[PDB]
Amino acid sequence: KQVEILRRLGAKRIAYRSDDWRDLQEALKKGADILIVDATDKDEAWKQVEILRRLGAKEIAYRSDDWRDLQEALKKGADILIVDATDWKQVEILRRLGAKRIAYRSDDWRDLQEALKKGADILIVDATDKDEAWKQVEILRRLGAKEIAYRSDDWRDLQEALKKGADILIVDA
């Protein structure tokens, strides 16, 4: 009962990531709040957005670093765009494309802070490739960030992120 236990830990918003839209749908059925489609490693990933929307998903995020790809995801119903902060004047362009919610992902909290200063809505800290990543949550909260997402597959690590002020937990399905 991953979702159920995440809820018990105190997770108010839970996102699920997967290369298989079938996995995102199962997470939707289990109560996930956000489904994350990854377009950086496959073709026409907006077709996953279309499927999941037809199957009732109401909150879809789309990870891409390609402008026409991000635009197609918005057109197909994606609610959150996730872009790379490691390379932001792109924020205003994403806005004008039509993005209502913009998330930035980076291994470096300094990049996440720059994105925040330029108008990003969500900052994503990645704990799958480094230790004690909740220290990034800590710093970002003290630097004014109010909406931080934390990607990890370790239970104690996810809990520590919540305790340090992460608002969204991203788990890999």
Author numbering: 8 to 94, 99 to 184
Paper text:
The salt bridge variants exhibit similar thermostability in comparison with their parental designs but important differences in the conformational stability at 25°C can be observed such as a highly stabilizing effect for two of the proteins but a destabilizing effect to the third. Analysis of the formed geometries of the salt bridge cluster in the crystal structures show either highly ordered salt bridge clusters or only single salt bridges. Rosetta modeling of the salt bridge clusters results in a good prediction of the tendency on stability changes but not the geometries observed in the three‐dimensional structures.
